[PDB]
């Protein structure tokens, strides 16, 4: 069901965590890293849906980065 492999995702999450934390010892529950990935993928899916509304608004059928940037801008 999840489209990103769990190991690449967890390496990216850990890297981002360590950059924020600068080395403070934290660890993640497996259920935590899963919650995060599930929400990340759902976020990307719904952003793709929103941005595709803009593709069609521009009279296109191919998603362009401007469609995704406009959706992000309008989101917040």
């Amino acid at each position: 069901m999840l489209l990103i492999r769990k190991l690449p995702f967890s390496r990216l999450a850990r890297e981002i965590c360590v950059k924020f934390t600068r080395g403070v010892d934290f660890n993640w529950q497996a259920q935590a890293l899963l919650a995060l990935q599930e929400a990340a993928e759902a976020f990307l899916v719904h952003l793709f849906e929103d941005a595709y509304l803009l593709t069609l608004h521009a009279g296109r059928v191919t998603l362009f980065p401007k469609d995704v940037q406009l959706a992000r801008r309008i989101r917040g």
Binding site: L3, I4, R5, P8, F9, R11, L12, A13, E15, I16, C17, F20, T21, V24, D25, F26, N27, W28, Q29, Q31, A32, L34, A35, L36, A39, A40, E41, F43, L44, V45, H46, L47, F48, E49, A51, Y52, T55, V61, T62, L63, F64, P65, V68, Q69, R72
Partner: protein, 69 residues
């Protein structure tokens, strides 16, 4: 280590699940960028909340709290 591990087929399939069949080649780096920003914010908030609670293990409820913001 590492944003490039979010692969091109993963990205196409996420776009597909969101009803998008055709994407510009430029979408790969666009999605990487959006994902990194999303995780930076959620992870920041989740860990901050774990710290406020004087705990060392980030839980699913910590992540859920972060998402709610």
């Amino acid at each position: 280590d590492n944003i490039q591990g979010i692969t091109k087929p993963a990205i196409r399939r996420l776009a597909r699940r969101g009803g998008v069949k055709r994407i510009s080649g430029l979408i790969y780096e666009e999605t990487r960028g959006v994902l990194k920003v999303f995780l930076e914010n959620v992870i920041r908030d989740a860990v901050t909340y774990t710290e406020h609670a004087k705990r060392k293990t980030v839980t699913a409820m910590d992540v859920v709290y972060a998402l709610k913001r």
